[PDB]
Symmetry: D3
Subunit: 169 residues, 6 copies
Amino acid sequence: KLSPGKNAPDVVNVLVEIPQGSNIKYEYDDEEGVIKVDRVLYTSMNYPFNYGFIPGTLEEDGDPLDVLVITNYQLYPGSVIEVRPIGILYMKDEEGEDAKIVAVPKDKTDPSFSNIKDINDLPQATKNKIVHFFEHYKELEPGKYVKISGWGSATEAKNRIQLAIKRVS
Amino acid sequence: KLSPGKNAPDVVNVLVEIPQGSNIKYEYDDEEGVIKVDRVLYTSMNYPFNYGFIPGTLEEDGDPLDVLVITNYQLYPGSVIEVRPIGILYMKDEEGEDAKIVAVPKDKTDPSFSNIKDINDLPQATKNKIVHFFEHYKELEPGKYVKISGWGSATEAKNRIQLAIKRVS
Amino acid sequence: KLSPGKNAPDVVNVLVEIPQGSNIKYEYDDEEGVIKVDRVLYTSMNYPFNYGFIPGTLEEDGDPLDVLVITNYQLYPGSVIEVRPIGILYMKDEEGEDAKIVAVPKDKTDPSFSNIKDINDLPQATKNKIVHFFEHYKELEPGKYVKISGWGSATEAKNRIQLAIKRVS
Amino acid sequence: KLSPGKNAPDVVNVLVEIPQGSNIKYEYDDEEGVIKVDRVLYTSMNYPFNYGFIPGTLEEDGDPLDVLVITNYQLYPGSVIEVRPIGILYMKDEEGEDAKIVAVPKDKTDPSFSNIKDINDLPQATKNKIVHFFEHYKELEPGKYVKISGWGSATEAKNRIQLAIKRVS
Amino acid sequence: KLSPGKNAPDVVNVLVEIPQGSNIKYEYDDEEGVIKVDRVLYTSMNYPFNYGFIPGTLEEDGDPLDVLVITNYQLYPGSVIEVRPIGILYMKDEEGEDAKIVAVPKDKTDPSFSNIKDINDLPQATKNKIVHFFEHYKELEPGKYVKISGWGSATEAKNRIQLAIKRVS
Amino acid sequence: KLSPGKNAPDVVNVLVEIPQGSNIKYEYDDEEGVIKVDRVLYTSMNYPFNYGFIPGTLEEDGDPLDVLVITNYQLYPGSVIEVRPIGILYMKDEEGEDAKIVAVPKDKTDPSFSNIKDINDLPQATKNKIVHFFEHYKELEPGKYVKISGWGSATEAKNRIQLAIKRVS
Ligand SMILES: [Mg+2]
Ligand SMILES: [Mg+2]
Ligand SMILES: [Mg+2]
Ligand SMILES: [Mg+2]
Ligand SMILES: [Mg+2]
Ligand SMILES: [Mg+2]
């Protein structure tokens, strides 16, 4: 009942699962059609961004493409927001390779993020925080782990989204 | 899947979209069936009431009738509450004429609003706050504006709801 | 669209209606498919636990089986969490007999409740708080009342869930 | 270093100890000059008002006169607010007789409480909530109890404040 | 008992009075030594920044120099934070001329604001929000008003702070 | 103006600096007598406990003895609470050796922690969370680091407190 957006990949729809600041990992279950509590982070950390996925996309891992929506406020689990991809984050975990889109709200939704057009527009401190988060929030979970490969530019991210949409199309 | 209520217009159902205190304009999309983030208020203001609409009603502007639910607590976006209309607010914006119902929770739901039976039961300060809100929260948005015409009594509001229901029913 | 869980009664699904700390009694309406606001507690109290029901179960009172999910954080109304029943609470109200399951999140979801395996693992103070809550939160409501009969063990609770599931299944 | 106010008893200073909605009983210790945590309510209730005392007053019980500040927002422990007494609440506990002033913020501070000039201006539901609170929040505490005698008018309250001030000054 | 800071004007101490997001105007009273509640904004707006003053400074208006601390989190009323002035805001109100320093936390305190070195580093949207705030938050107050003259650079701000300190020193 | 408590080391006073859940490192400055914002954690973590120190104590590092107050609620910065030491945490950082007391509120203050009498009463998950926190929250800060040596029993903790008090007295 949801699509990636008429203007993909320049602007895409993101269904929020985890509000920013949260320390509870919610996960949207398309089958049952509900937001399920996967697990309460075993570490004393919290999501430094709103987390969700672009509906109508499919990655090589069989899952829709994830998005790290950067704002200074939280959104409600299950709400949809239109974002602008500004980059991509490459990483490897116990399951294998993975990539997550990094985005800010589209300009008309929140004009205070208009100057952030690419991953290099983010303060170094913010990038370090995000990287550190992914590399330590699952540590205390038996057999899990994450290692950040590197970052990608907005153009790169836009491509990943294109393929992800094509796979389902 | 929702109706205005078996006791309309004395008591009607309101599907909440924007929780009170919020500064993010959420919008319920009946098509996709989700709560979408329209935009984050460009001004440093926040909704002085829970905002939503009466399902199963239609106004001359092609949209369902809006309601300003007055309480001293927030409700969750997407939840339904039974209210008592106590008035109506008339205004004009860039799109034209508009009217919004003003209501408090029905007595059984919250007996602390039982003595507020009509618009004149609200403190002058509260009315001024609401009027000022509508006249300034969109200011910074290009080409958008709002001007309050005046207020209407509960009886007036009950009528508006009656017509709005007929149009559909 | 929801079930009690593949591992019932050892681990069951609970659809949350009232987040912990809340003083607003939300109700999930399966018909309309929405979370409605039943009422705002007339007393100055708040739910000392996340409240919800096990989907796909039926009790002698014609309603699904309730669950008191104990955690130190709130969950979003309408979200599903997997719990471990650790006990049962027996009570009688104006409508008659009633029983409510007491549970903690399943181990993988929140390993900090792993030591709590049965009702006697809960501090006496916590039990007194819960009992006192049920016996006083409806007091100010005309003709309503609740009296706690006693507590049951985890095994007892697991049985109640078994029957409740069979009735429907 | 604090006084009851230049306009006592029409408008008095109230040093807030317990923010509204709180379930932790804070107490201001004039000796040490700090806000101490007396106890965390044993019951699942919370203060339906901001609680504090009028500095520079003394009652027959050797303690300053208490005030129940009614607002729809919380104030910070240790902050001072100017209120308008609108009534008085008479009660008896394990220690003996007691009276607590009921007030709303002074008009200039919050004009939305301007219509509430006396205790009878408060909704019945609000009064019942407050009374029920005092009669049940200490129940689970060994040997403590409270019974509400009745209410007093604003004029009555203004007198109590006058005496309480004279005793000290 | 507080000073502007050993590194003034490059880094100065700011005693916070109003936490960001607040809609209650708190005021630090050096005499009584407490945080008072001046009033509750009559408009439905809230401070888009943490507000406070640099202790040990004096302006031509007889008051210490104000500071608009920009962060994406709130600080506790009465707490001190070390900031970096990045600009100054010139305005006119019913009382006359006025200037307010604009600052971000010093780098060690919060390295995510390190890239904001001057007023022109702030998004246009953020500046518009702040300006709009000052020009409308007092509107509903009888006889009050504010008009923004313009902005000043960090160097300008550093000078204002220098004078303000010498007046007292 | 504050002491460790008449019943030290069985029950001691703890002046709270950092409320639980916080991600801003507040620090009490006895000189200026204010709560200062040291820094906003560079990592996406938050204090899994209320943090503070026992007034009137001195450790070999020239600083008062720290305490990790464990509760499921936050306390206000600058407030004092009476705790029961249940253990001690040994660690080493860039500055050298360090020990921090672990405590729960005294029984009368919060009877729901009465069953936790020693460090081994805490769930393994909780201990892992605390250890992981200390070992990663300063990581992104240049030249800082922390390594946990091990835990100590309540008796051990009581001794450390005794010496720390003796040094000052
Ligand atoms: Mg993936
Ligand atoms: Mg309309
Ligand atoms: Mg039942
Ligand atoms: Mg008394
Ligand atoms: Mg000035
Ligand atoms: Mg130390």
